[PDB]
Amino acid sequence: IDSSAIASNIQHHADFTPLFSPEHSSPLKAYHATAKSVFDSLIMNWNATYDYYNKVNAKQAYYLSMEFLQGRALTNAIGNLELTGQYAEALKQLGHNLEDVASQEPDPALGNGGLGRLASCFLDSLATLNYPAWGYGLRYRYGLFKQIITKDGQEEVAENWLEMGNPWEIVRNDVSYPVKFYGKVVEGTDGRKHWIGGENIKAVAHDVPIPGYKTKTTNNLRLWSTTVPSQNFDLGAFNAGDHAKANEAHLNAEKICHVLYPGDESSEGKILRLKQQYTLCSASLQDIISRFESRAGDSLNWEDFPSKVAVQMNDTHPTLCIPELMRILMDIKGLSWNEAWSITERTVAYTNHTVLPEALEKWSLDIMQKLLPRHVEIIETIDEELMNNIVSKYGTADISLLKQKLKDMRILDNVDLPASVAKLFIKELDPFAKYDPQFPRVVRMANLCVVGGHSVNGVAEIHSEIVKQDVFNSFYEMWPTKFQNKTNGVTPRRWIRFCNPELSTIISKWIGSDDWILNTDKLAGLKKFADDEDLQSEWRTAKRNNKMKVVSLIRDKTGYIVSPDAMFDVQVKRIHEYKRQLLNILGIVYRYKKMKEMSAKDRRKSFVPRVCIFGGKAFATYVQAKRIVKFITDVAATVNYDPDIGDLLKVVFVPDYNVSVAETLIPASELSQHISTAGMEASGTSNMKFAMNGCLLIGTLDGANVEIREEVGEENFFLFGAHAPEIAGLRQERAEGKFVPDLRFEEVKEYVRSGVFGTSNYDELMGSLEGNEGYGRADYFLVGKDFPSYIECQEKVDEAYRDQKLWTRMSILNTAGSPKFSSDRTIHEYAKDIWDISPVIMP
Amino acid sequence: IDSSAIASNIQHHADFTPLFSPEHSSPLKAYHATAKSVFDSLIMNWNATYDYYNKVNAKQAYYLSMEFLQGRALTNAIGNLELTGQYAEALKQLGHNLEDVASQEPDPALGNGGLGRLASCFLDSLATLNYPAWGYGLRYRYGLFKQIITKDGQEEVAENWLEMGNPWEIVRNDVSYPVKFYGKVVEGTDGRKHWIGGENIKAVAHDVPIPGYKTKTTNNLRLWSTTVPSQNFDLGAFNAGDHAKANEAHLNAEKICHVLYPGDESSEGKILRLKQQYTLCSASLQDIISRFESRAGDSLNWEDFPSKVAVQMNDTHPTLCIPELMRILMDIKGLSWNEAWSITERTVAYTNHTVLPEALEKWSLDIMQKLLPRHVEIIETIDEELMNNIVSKYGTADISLLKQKLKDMRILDNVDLPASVAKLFIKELDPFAKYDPQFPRVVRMANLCVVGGHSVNGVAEIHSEIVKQDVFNSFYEMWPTKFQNKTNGVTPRRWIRFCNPELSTIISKWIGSDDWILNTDKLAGLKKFADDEDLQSEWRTAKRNNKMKVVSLIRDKTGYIVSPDAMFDVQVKRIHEYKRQLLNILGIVYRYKKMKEMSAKDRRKSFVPRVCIFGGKAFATYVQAKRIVKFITDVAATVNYDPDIGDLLKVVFVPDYNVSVAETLIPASELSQHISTAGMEASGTSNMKFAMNGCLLIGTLDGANVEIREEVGEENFFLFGAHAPEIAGLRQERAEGKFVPDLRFEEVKEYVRSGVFGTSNYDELMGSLEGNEGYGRADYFLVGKDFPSYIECQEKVDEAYRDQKLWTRMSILNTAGSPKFSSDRTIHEYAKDIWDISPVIMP
Ligand SMILES: OC[C@H]1O[C@H](O[C@H]2[C@H](O)[C@@H](O)[C@@H](O[C@H]3[C@H](O)[C@@H](O)[C@@H](O[C@H]4[C@H](O)[C@@H](O)[C@H](O)O[C@@H]4CO)O[C@@H]3CO)O[C@@H]2CO)[C@H](O)[C@@H](O)[C@@H]1O
Ligand SMILES: OC[C@H]1O[C@H](O[C@H]2[C@H](O)[C@@H](O)[C@@H](O[C@H]3[C@H](O)[C@@H](O)[C@@H](O[C@H]4[C@H](O)[C@@H](O)[C@H](O)O[C@@H]4CO)O[C@@H]3CO)O[C@@H]2CO)[C@H](O)[C@@H](O)[C@@H]1O
Ligand SMILES: OC[C@H]1O[C@H](O[C@H]2[C@H](O)[C@@H](O)[C@@H](O)O[C@@H]2CO)[C@H](O)[C@@H](O)[C@@H]1O
Ligand SMILES: OC[C@H]1O[C@H](O[C@H]2[C@H](O)[C@@H](O)[C@@H](O)O[C@@H]2CO)[C@H](O)[C@@H](O)[C@@H]1O
Ligand SMILES: *Cc1c(COP(=O)(O)O)cnc(C)c1O
Ligand SMILES: *Cc1c(COP(=O)(O)O)cnc(C)c1O
């Protein structure tokens, strides 16, 4: 299977599955063709893998998520098939360049943060390790948004990734499932419940093959596109002139897949958010059920269901899986409550990803009751049961104790207790056991997930402890055997081998083979070579070579001109008060001010030259975050064009940070920042990407840094800031006026109010770092607190960078320390300890 | 290139361009694959033809139309490539059946009536005869509508043909043209006009190859799909919860291509109707201009434009081509008025298709002025010129005469005359030369088309005379050399060879070859064999064999059970008061009543057994037409289940009449009806299809029947009814109470009011056949008048069918008489006498 045949297959797809005029010649045209030529290998293998799983009828694992940051598939598919050399040559013959062709691929608009990229890494590992597993998600048309950076700060534009269609997917027209909204429940002849009426849509499957590395195993991300049958278009409306009304039905079905995490401060935004989730659950489960039945055939027994199916709820979005499975098993197959509940408990598992409350979903019962009346019936029964198990395991005797246990674990909050439990609170009836109209009736999804899943895990050792101690305590006490940990990871094929081929050469040379790509434990053999100077020379050169690609990026995307002989200092992540991009920039602002009040001789002596690179998207509606990116941009303009500074300091905000950007940025990075308020980050995965590439980490004792420190060693990691235990203390200290800030921190704040950074003075932004009390103020994320610790920590980073022997020694020990953070071992752990699945290898 | 390789190509497309799960097995899946396997041959040849035309830079002809009834492509593509035998065998190997696979193809929803099917026939002839010509149109998503027949009559459902995508098209992503609505005009530095602002959309090309018969020549139907760039989607709107507002821009662009001939009783429906047309013109012309320029290259001279381009305006919908070409030539290329006008005059030509006023488009100036302000400026200048040419060619002297000439030919009606011409009417100023607010300001498009095109033709000899005498008289007088005739035709490959293979065997046998398919004149050699009994036997059997396919159709689509040993009497056409389906059914109702008042012995003696088959769609908003289909259905129920009748008479209304239905119906037909009120049908093409298949015609001296009678001979055609000259006379006779109807016609009307045809008595419908005066009444289409002539004519049809030697002799002479009605010679005529194009044969 040689390069000359491949160049013919490329030509073929350009001409015989064409998207452009024949005489037209574009890199973009070359991409759609090359994509399709590669894809042929994936279809062959996809079908082989599909057919073999059906034969073997092995337990299949199903990963549900609202997010998938797939990123560009081309170079990773080609790389995994090991046709990387030959596709490169093929494109030379045709007057093209692979790097240039690959760069025309649009990033799928299917995700946002770690949650999505984690899921994606997971799928690559799962395929690579021959595990039978699919991903289920929604096919978002416009995604979250494409970030543009103007003079007003961030602006959001809808993404265009599907405008010419996605070559990396396959429409499965025979795979359509009906999904239902609103309606009402009634009891049929056969005493069985029947959910009728309401609005009805159909979800259609779009498959995205996941090619394994050096394996024929090709798994699948099945993506739901919602629509309605053309007949639901209203010609009466259209011919009468009312063209929007004519189109109402199509809009409502289709908007479900328009935007990721749509704004929900409106009742209409909530209903959509909820329709998004139900669709994911309903369509996905129906399909899972379907596959179980065709494989079972004549020998069909539902008790076999949890031994053939594992469903993984990634955060609380897919919670509805639980009652949805109960609906199908009872209303459609005629299983009894306990029979269905037993099966459900053992099929579902839950991973929590953040102690942040935007993930601890609460829903209005009234909305849910209206949209999904049958599911509320089911939850009502589940919550009645849950309370009877609590009654058993505790009280009747101690009522005030029992009262507390019931608040904590209740799924439906502020509802009239079931008759059974209300009994215990007569005096008559206690107000606690009664719905209070002064407050909302709420459905607490996280509790329902804890009840419904046989396993509950977090994503880092510190975090899964927080989960057991702070978040779900009464539940841990009841079912200690539910609670686990599965520390996150990242695929080393996309995040070393294919994003950083230059380093990858150096790695396989000194370890003696390239097997580490798969058996990443074998990177540890670099520890001993850490002080060899010849290794160090190749290692430093590689970093420098990758830095020149970023100089191109910054030049092109922002217009700024930046030298690669400086320290590349990066912070790229979702723009949130808690991740504290604000802390970082203010630290830069302090050094900027010091440089400006200092002689040009001393400037060289005092500070190492840096290029401080920010990136990430600010949730559009999040007002304060958006002001933070605006602010960063303003500082950039002021610093980069100052002749007193020059190449001693540059500050750059790279627009539209996504998988593609990270793939260039990360390998070129020498210092990355992960400086979240301690105990707020659950894990974080860029941490792990950076370390794999020999990037050093400056950060807090928070999430995955903790374990990353353990692996690479305290001496090869820049630690600063208050620790997790001390947080709420330092806050309440602030509340009673007891915190007095560093003199240097007051200096910076006022130097910002000086107005040297444009016509804006930002008294409003600095205002969130002041006062003792009140929402949006009181420096809740401890920026002013950790400030002095931090800027002092940055002095030690300077001094280390001065000894490039040391810096490179440490650089190397981070790569040597990374193997724990391979998504491969994250998968093994999941596979053994939760899913209980076995690999399946085709002959 | 053998059948065994083709079956592999089919398998390949099923697996390597898949639309369904791999284990799924459907006739439908087999179609999409087979379609794609055939398509590969078309792409090869499409590109060969494309490239060769560019080389030769031969004058290209461009057919613009709002309609294209393409019909199913599969068997016609396969047939034209002459791979018909081998594709049939290929499908047997794969466990499938071509007829069964072909029947899964959805009819494109791209047309409605003759206008569309004519255009389509034309494209097949043009490719077949090696003429360089494209068709330009819009890609309608939901089409006009899918007709369903319920107990309430007709109901309209939006068509679903694109739900899985069209295998027979190619998206040309590099071909996008901006189209602009509203806005305003301003004068730039360079004294040149500039149209700025307003709403902006983009039209994208979708190509549909037109394979020629036994030729490599593969021409093109370029179809415009309107949209906007994803960035015009409003995230602010979406995140705020206002999901319709977020989507407003996309809806407005996209709705342009949603429905064919959208209802326009609303100002909003008119603006759309107009946006549809402008888009067709604007996008198409820009593309034409573009191709001219790339072929011209360095040697570019605009005086060469009409020697390289011919644009054909099919009816008044593409009228805007005229001022649109003027816009581009002046505002974009900088040609002067006379330079651009000279070129425009010689590029554009106009075909009028009906003296019916829904085609003689009048537009409100105020709407047009708002939507297309620059185009009105241009029309204003054209109308000023037109009036100066009339001033020259007539008056100043005779003013009342000149007044009359100006009313008739004026493009803008009820507008203030230009200063120049207003001069001639001072007394002061004559009210005639002044805008009267008591009436609308109107733009008369047909006049503009006459002014703008170097040729004006009709579509049958009688009609093109009507056009010169009645419709455009003053214009004919001014420019007699503009006015022509091009009698319509139909492609004999789709309408004999491939719809009727059984007959096609018989044809090539007795003529000695199959060259007639191409050189259809050679059917004339059948005249002499008309009385050979062995020919007659094969001929009768074929008809009977094709009738058994219709028994299946009627059984399946309506549920009625009908014997093929009866006369198959068909009327299938758009349901219009003027085509007079009402006349036909009432004639049936008369025979029904006669049979019911008669002994069962006499019933056999008096009437030949018939199956009377109606079909066609009633424009949804057209209230009276819809009542006519309702009525027909009610009669069907009453007649078909009457034991006194049995198989002596059946009446059937076939739902959703389209190309596909006609392909089964026509070859099986023995009598077809074309009974329009004389002088109202321009041509008609089903006439010609029926005759080609040996179907006899009963009809009026109207449109193409006239010439069809001339060809097959008066003795082989059933003529009835008042003639064209006598019409308006018979009407005004009615107006002054002088018409007294036949006693048998009053009998039928009252027998309908009897209520024997269901709970409806239809006094409202019969009401349109009564009175002397008033809109919707007064029997304007002369149903009661022609009635006695007609039912008596049907007695002669009975008596002829009794002598099957005679009937079959006549059947044969109709096929022998058809060659004139081949779209091939219609094309030759157009090509020589209007377009002035030459064929181009590749080596
Ligand atoms: O992949 C990364 C994470 O993804 C998921 O988190 C998403 C949330 O579930 C989703 O709701 C959304 O959350 C945004 C809020 O909707 C939005 O209001 C805002 O929150 C602000 C609020 O606007 C403001 O009034 C207040 O002062 O501050 C709030 C934050 O403290 O922003 C939210 C996100 O930035 O977006 C999330 C992804 O961006 C998973 O749930 C999570 O576990 C993953 O880590
Ligand atoms: O392909 C066949 C023909 O196509 C084109 O004709 C189309 C018309 O241009 C288009 O406007 C439309 O016309 C329909 C009217 O819009 C609709 O109102 C109705 O007209 C009725 C009216 O509703 C009613 O009030 C009155 O009593 O009677 C009117 C008719 O006399 O129906 C019209 C069509 O049935 O549809 C046409 C195609 O269906 C070409 O223009 C034409 O030349 C072709 O022959
Ligand atoms: O982004 C989340 C939000 O959390 C904090 O809200 C505090 C607030 O200070 C209190 O008044 C009360 O409302 O407790 C909340 C935490 O439980 C921050 O105040 C705010 O800055 C931050 O944006
Ligand atoms: O479908 C068209 C429509 O045409 C006729 O309208 C007549 C009408 O009778 C007159 O009162 C005046 O309005 O002249 C028109 C023709 O110029 C028919 O009357 C009507 O039945 C028919 O539907
Ligand atoms: C790895 C990755 C993330 C997650 O980063 P955190 O460190 O968890 O904030 C987000 N976005 C993209 C594009 C990534 O590649
Ligand atoms: C030929 C044809 C027509 C045109 O028929 P007329 O006799 O002009 O009314 C309309 N529709 C279809 C599907 C056809 O095949």
Short mmCIF file of C-alpha atoms in Angstrom, two decimals, chain B residues 113-115 353-359 571 573-584 622 624-625 628 674-685 700 702-703 720 727 731 769 779-783 786:
data_model
loop_
_atom_site.label_atom_id
_atom_site.label_comp_id
_atom_site.label_asym_id
_atom_site.label_seq_id
_atom_site.Cartn_x
_atom_site.Cartn_y
_atom_site.Cartn_z
CA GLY B 113 -46.42 22.11 -15.47
CA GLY B 114 -45.47 22.08 -19.14
CA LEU B 115 -43.13 25.04 -18.67
CA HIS B 353 -46.13 30.48 -22.95
CA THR B 354 -49.67 31.57 -22.19
CA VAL B 355 -52.04 34.36 -22.97
CA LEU B 356 -53.18 33.67 -19.28
CA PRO B 357 -52.65 36.77 -17.00
CA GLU B 358 -50.87 34.94 -14.11
CA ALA B 359 -47.97 34.80 -16.64
CA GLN B 571 -57.06 13.34 -18.57
CA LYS B 573 -53.11 18.00 -16.31
CA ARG B 574 -53.01 20.97 -13.91
CA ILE B 575 -56.53 21.36 -12.48
CA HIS B 576 -57.90 24.58 -13.94
CA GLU B 577 -61.38 25.76 -14.82
CA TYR B 578 -60.05 26.36 -18.37
CA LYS B 579 -58.59 22.90 -18.99
CA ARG B 580 -62.11 21.79 -18.12
CA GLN B 581 -61.79 18.62 -16.08
CA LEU B 582 -65.31 19.69 -15.12
CA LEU B 583 -66.50 19.22 -18.72
CA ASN B 584 -65.08 15.68 -18.77
CA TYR B 622 -57.46 28.24 -6.14
CA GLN B 624 -62.87 26.39 -7.21
CA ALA B 625 -60.27 23.99 -8.67
CA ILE B 628 -63.46 20.12 -8.73
CA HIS B 674 -57.14 17.77 -24.29
CA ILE B 675 -60.44 19.61 -24.15
CA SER B 676 -59.44 23.17 -23.10
CA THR B 677 -61.65 26.12 -23.96
CA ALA B 678 -60.50 26.92 -27.47
CA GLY B 679 -57.77 29.58 -27.67
CA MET B 680 -56.70 29.29 -24.02
CA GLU B 681 -54.09 26.56 -24.29
CA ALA B 682 -50.94 27.90 -25.93
CA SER B 683 -49.47 24.52 -26.92
CA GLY B 684 -49.55 21.64 -24.47
CA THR B 685 -47.00 18.83 -24.49
CA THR B 700 -60.73 21.08 -29.18
CA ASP B 702 -56.78 24.65 -29.57
CA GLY B 703 -53.01 24.92 -29.23
CA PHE B 720 -65.22 18.74 -30.97
CA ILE B 727 -65.41 32.39 -28.30
CA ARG B 731 -69.69 34.82 -24.28
CA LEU B 769 -72.07 27.35 -14.76
CA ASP B 779 -69.94 29.66 -17.48
CA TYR B 780 -67.02 31.71 -18.83
CA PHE B 781 -65.16 28.62 -20.04
CA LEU B 782 -68.13 27.46 -22.16
CA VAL B 783 -68.72 24.13 -20.46
CA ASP B 786 -69.51 22.67 -25.83
#
